[PDB]
Amino acid sequence: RKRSRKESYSIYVYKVLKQVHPDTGISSKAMGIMNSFVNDIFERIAGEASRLAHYNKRSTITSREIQTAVRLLLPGELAKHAVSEGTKAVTKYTSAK
Template sequence: MQQPQQVDEDETQPADEPEEMPTPPQIEAVQKKAQAQKRKPGPSHKVEGEKRKKKRAKVGASEGYRTYVYKVMKQVHPDMGISSKAMTILNNLMGDMFERIANEAAILAKYVGRATLASVDIQDAVKLVLPGELGKHAIAEGTKAVANYVSSVGKSKSKA
């Protein structure tokens, strides 16, 4: 009589070689070793005396113009304060005006066929968004502010 041959259900292993399943302690040791390698960077990554740089916390978009409105208010009226509701209203007003002027300037630049905004586009947008004398004064103050900035940047470069 012939003995029936052993049939291996797993076709990946030959029938004459026994399958080796790792025991649970071996699995745990392999996992611990992998975790230890992930946690500890090699000595080549570390330089003596070097500390990791702290990441700056991102300032939320909710700040907006609040800081600048407050600084200007203190320049004009040092003894005055402002409520948080009034500050929110001014912040929203500034954001709205910026958006209106930017959109109008973009439309003007597209109309002319340019991809880059020029100062003339901003000035024309201000004239369209702000009526009459208000627009003229805004352009004059904006031009003055840009001139002050350019002169202050030129001075700081010459010192360096």
């Protein structure tokens, strides 16, 4: 009866997939790939933010730091669009409390 609990990002990837291509499915291996990919990007960004924080003797990670790290790690137009989405997200979240 003993049973563990392993979390993932699967269900959310499935949601996004159904949003962009309703008549399409995805296999377990690829979902695992996407899971590992998400984990990798998460680790890179958080580590980079940490390094920026530590270099400026600031003890708080904010949206600003994330934005900076994004501009550092990713190239060009991808950065700009993603940054747009992030800013839009913050503007929506901060208003409709």
